[PDB]
Amino acid sequence: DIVMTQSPDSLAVSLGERATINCKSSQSVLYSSNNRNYLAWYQQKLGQPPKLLIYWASTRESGVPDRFSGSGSGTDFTLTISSLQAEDVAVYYCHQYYSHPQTFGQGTKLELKR
């Protein structure tokens, strides 16, 4: 099975700060046939379902602001928020959809720091 590992487990950030969170897959998720990484990021606000932010490691979903960006390839992936807004406080998950079983990380809690 591909195992997804996120770090840090939690990060406290103040309004307007840059925030970076990391995800590693235990095997590469780069598909040679299309040169795409089968890696997605989701945001889960409190009491809500997860919501798709990024797919193919770096493509932003429609409805997602430009302050969110994804990067990386192979096994090593990052999600960056360039300027934290209050509404961005949430748990963020990475997801590989390269092969069954599809698997998720355990999340990074992005908390508001006063």
Binding site: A40, P49, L52, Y93, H95, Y97, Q102, F104
Partner: protein, 118 residues
């Protein structure tokens, strides 16, 4: 405009059964791959089951195979999950999810809580 409405969550004794439903609207359900994904409190999502667009074709997480069955009815725009031989470790919020054909999860429902307990 995509709406995914799960129902059927409730309390189950260990060893018992429960059927979940997901009512889909606002998109072409029949041409969509569908999934059940669950999330226990404080944990990350866990994929449970997939069913391909059209005429279907299923896959399951190893730990639910032989216990759970995913099915769909395209005319009814409904997805089901029949869960048998439930155990405490199956307690979670269960989500109905539409996947892109590549596999990423485009739309999630609000979820239905399943509680398995003596």
């Amino acid at each position: 405009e995509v709406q995914l409405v799960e129902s059927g969550g409730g309390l189950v004794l260990p060893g018992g059964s429960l059927k979940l439903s997901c009512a889909a609207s606002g998109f072409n359900f029949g041409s969509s791959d569908m999934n059940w994904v669950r999330q226990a409190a404080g944990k990350g999502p866990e994929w449970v089951a997939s069913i391909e667009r059209g005429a279907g074709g299923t896959d399951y997480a190893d730990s639910v195979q032989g216990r759970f069955t995913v099915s769909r009815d395209n005319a009814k725009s409904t997805l089901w999950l029949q869960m048998n031989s439930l155990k405490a470790e199956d307690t979670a919020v269960y989500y109905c999810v539409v996947s892109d054909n590549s596999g990423y999860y485009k739309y999630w429902g609000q979820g239905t809580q399943v509680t398995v307990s003596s």
